[PDB]
Amino acid sequence: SLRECELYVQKHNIQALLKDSIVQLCTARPERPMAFLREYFEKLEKEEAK
Amino acid sequence: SLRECELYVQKHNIQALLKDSIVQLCTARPERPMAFLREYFEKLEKE
C-alpha cells in the first residue's frame, strides 16, 4: 500500500529528514556522498539518544 | 551557491540515490529510520 508508506513517511517526518540531508550534501559537497550520509545519520542517531 | 548545489546533485545522481533509499524504507517501515538509513548507505557503500 502506497497508503502504509505515506502514513509512515508522515509520522517520521521523512520529507524533513530528506530535506536536511540535501542541505548538508549541498553544504559539504562530499567526494563520497554515501559515506557522508552514513556518517550524518549516525550523528543524528547519537544526538537523538543524547 | 545554488548552481554549485544543482550540479553536485546531478553529477552524483543524488536524486536517484535518495529515492532508492526511500523505496527500501517504505518496504521495511523500520522502528528506527535513521539506523535503517545508516545501514543502507553502509551496505551501498560496500557494494
Binding site: 508508506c5 521523512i14 | 546533485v9 529515492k19 526511500i22
Partner: peptide
C-alpha cells in the same frame, strides 16, 4: 534560503517518485 527552498522541493519530488514506485 535558495538552498533550503531547493532542498524542500527536491525532497518532495523524490518522495513522490518513491511512493509511485512502491505501488
Amino acid at each position: 534560503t535558495v538552498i533550503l527552498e531547493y532542498a524542500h522541493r527536491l525532497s518532495q519530488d523524490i518522495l513522490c517518485d518513491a511512493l509511485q514506485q512502491w505501488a
